[PDB]
Structures are given as structure tokens and as C-alpha cells.
């Protein structure tokens, strides 16, 4: 019939995804705007999805995990500038993927690579 029964929602996954992407797509001109668009203590994670895409398969839904859990104090963006590789060299992208943090327009830490443990660690570490 229908397997509809659940209490709350915690860290439950299956490498699935579903409709409800939180990774905000932004263009070059929207970058500073969206970084400043934060209210207060809003941790902004800027993903640099390089077209190589290695462990990105797991990390993408894992980021959405943390995005949906922490969305009350977190907002993730993904920059659309696939033509300009300089952006990588400028922002210091050296892995696939690479996550920069910003908060209230103020400079925040950067986690390069695909380590969801380090990502979540810094998320809670930078919210609190």
C-alpha cells in the first residue's frame, strides 16, 4: 500500500538524493551579493564544483545532508564560472571538490578535498 511512517529526520541516507537541492547556484555577479545576503551568523559554504568530479558523488548528497540539517544557520552556494579557471587559482582550489566558508561577508575557513567529517566539524565549529 504505502510505507509512510517516520518521526523526525536525522542523519539517514542511502547515497540517494531526491528533489530538494539546497546547493544554491549563483553566477559571477551574484557571488558577493549572496555572500553578503546572509542575515546573522549564517555560515556560507561556497562549493567549487570542478568538472573533474571524483568523490563528489558521495560528497554532494552529504553536503545536502549538512545543508538541510544546518540550513537554519547555513547556506551553501555553487559558483557558475566554468569558463574561468583562474577562479580556482585565486580562491585556492587544489582538490575535487573544494569548500570555502564565509560569514557576514567576513573571511572564514576553507576545507579543500572530500572529507565530510572535516566539513561538518568546521560547520558546527563556525556556527558555534
Catalogue the active-site residues.
53, 56
Cell representation of residue 57: 558523488
> Which residues sit opposite 110 in a β-bridge?
100
Question: How far is Cα of residue 106 from the mean position of the Cα atoms in its chain?
Answer: 17
Taking the C-alpha atoms of residue 77 and residue 48, their distance in angstroms, rounded to an integer, is 9
Q: What 3-state DSSP class applies to 107?
A: strand
Tell me which DSSP letter residue 96 carries. Answer: S
- What is the number of other CB atoms lying within 10 angstroms of the CB of residue 81? 14
41 φ, ψ (degrees, to nearest 5): 60, 15
Amino acid at each position: 500500500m504505502a510505507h509512510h511512517h517516520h518521526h523526525h529526520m536525522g542523519t539517514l541516507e542511502a547515497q540517494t538524493q531526491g528533489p530538494g537541492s539546497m546547493i544554491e547556484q549563483i553566477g559571477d555577479s551574484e557571488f558577493d551579493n549572496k555572500v553578503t545576503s546572509c542575515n546573522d551568523n549564517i555560515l556560507i559554504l561556497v562549493d567549487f564544483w570542478a568538472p573533474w568530479c571524483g568523490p563528489c558523488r558521495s560528497l554532494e548528497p552529504q553536503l545536502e545532508k549538512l545543508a538541510q540539517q544546518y540550513t537554519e544557520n547555513v547556506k551553501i552556494y555553487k559558483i557558475n564560472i566554468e569558463d574561468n579557471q583562474d577562479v580556482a587559482t585565486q580562491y585556492g582550489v587544489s582538490a575535487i571538490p573544494t569548500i570555502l566558508m564565509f560569514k557576514n561577508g567576513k573571511k572564514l575557513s576553507q576545507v579543500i578535498g572530500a572529507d565530510i567529517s572535516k566539513i561538518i566539524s568546521e560547520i558546527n565549529n563556525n556556527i558555534n
